[PDB]
């Protein structure tokens, strides 16, 4: 549930050298902040496999603090498909957009034996406060029969918050 990694600071020191050093360059920012940071690559991978902009990484870093960062971009260099830079978005309480994973819970839920599961989105974008952060979203919907398409408000909408809308869309259907 709680993902801590590390961080450090940098000013000079070409990212070519850092990257050559096993250390993944990146930046740290929010409304109130911008700062150059680097992390260990191997460290970051193990976390990011798991974390993955769905979950909060609390950083740490020296002058030890703990910053509620979301990761909002990863730049991989296309040739080797390995990340060449990350930028960490630090939370503080203002409503903020993000991607919350979806959990489809149930049986085929209608037209069983057999339908089409057909998940349109693996995630969803939701305007949410830093304080209450809905680490996943329950989707049951006993049907879901032939010709039905789930939009938005047909979704759980955890007690924390509202959507990033537009409410008219599709998540699952059976054809």
Partner 1 sequence: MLMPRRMKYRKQQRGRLKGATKGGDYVAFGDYGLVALEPAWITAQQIEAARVAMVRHFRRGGKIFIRIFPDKPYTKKPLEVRMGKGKGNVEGYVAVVKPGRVMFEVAGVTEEQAMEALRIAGHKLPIKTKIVRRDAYDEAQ
Binding site for partner 1 (CB under 8 A): 48-54, 74, 76, 78-81, 83, 99, 122-123
Selected binder of RNA within 3, 6, 8, 15 (CB under 7 A): 15
DSSP, residue by residue, 19-64: HHTTEEEEEEEETTEEEEEEEEHHHHHHHHHHSTTTS-B----TTT
CB of 56 to partner 1, least distance (A): 14
Query: Considering beta carbons, is residue 22 or 65 the nearer one to partner 1?
Result: 22
Selected binder of RNA within 6, 51, 85, 154 (CB under 7 A): 85
Per rule CB under 7 A, is residue 69 in the interface with RNA?
A: no
Q: How many residues bind RNA (CB under 7 A)?
A: 30
Give the position of tokens 């974008």: 125
Per rule CB under 7 A, is residue 26 in the interface with RNA?
A: yes
- Name which of partner 1, RNA, none residue 83 binds, using a CB cut-off of 5 to 8 Å depending on partner kind: partner 1
Bridging pattern class, strands 23-30 and 82-90: parallel
Coil vs helix vs strand at 163: coil
Note if the bond before 144 is cis, omega within 30 degrees.
yes
CB of 98 to RNA, least distance (A): 9
Query: Considering beta carbons, is residue 1 or 55 the nearer one to RNA?
Result: 55
Going by C-alpha positions, the residue among 97, 101, 91 that lies closest to residue 130 is 91
In order of 66, 168, 169, 170, the CA distances from 154 in angstroms are 36, 10, 11, 10
Per rule CB under 7 A, is residue 34 in the interface with RNA?
A: yes
Q: Which region, judged by CB under 7 A, interacts with RNA, from 40-48, 93-101, 102-110, 154-162?
A: 93-101
């Amino acid at each position: 549930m709680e993902y801590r990694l590390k961080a450090y600071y940098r000013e000079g020191e070409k990212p070519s050298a850092l990257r050559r050093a096993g250390k993944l360059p990146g930046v740290m920012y929010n409304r109130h902040l911008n700062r150059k940071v680097y992390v260990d690559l191997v460290e970051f991978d193990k976390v990011f496999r798991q974390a993955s902009i769905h979950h909060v990484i609390v950083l740490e870093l020296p002058d030890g603090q703990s910053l509620p960062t979301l990761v909002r971009q990863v730049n991989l260099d296309k040739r080797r498909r390995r990340p060449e830079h990350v930028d960490f978005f630090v939370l503080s309480d203002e409503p903020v957009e993000m991607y919350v994973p979806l959990r489809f819970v149930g049986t085929p839920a209608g037209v069983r034996a057999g339908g089409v599961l057909q998940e349109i989105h693996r995630d969803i974008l939701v305007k949410v406060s830093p304080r209450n952060i809905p680490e996943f979203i329950e989707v049951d919907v006993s049907g879901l029969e032939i010709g039905d398409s789930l939009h938005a408000s047909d979704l759980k909408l955890p007690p924390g918050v509202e959507l990033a809308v537009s409410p008219e869309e599709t998540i699952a259907a059976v054809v």
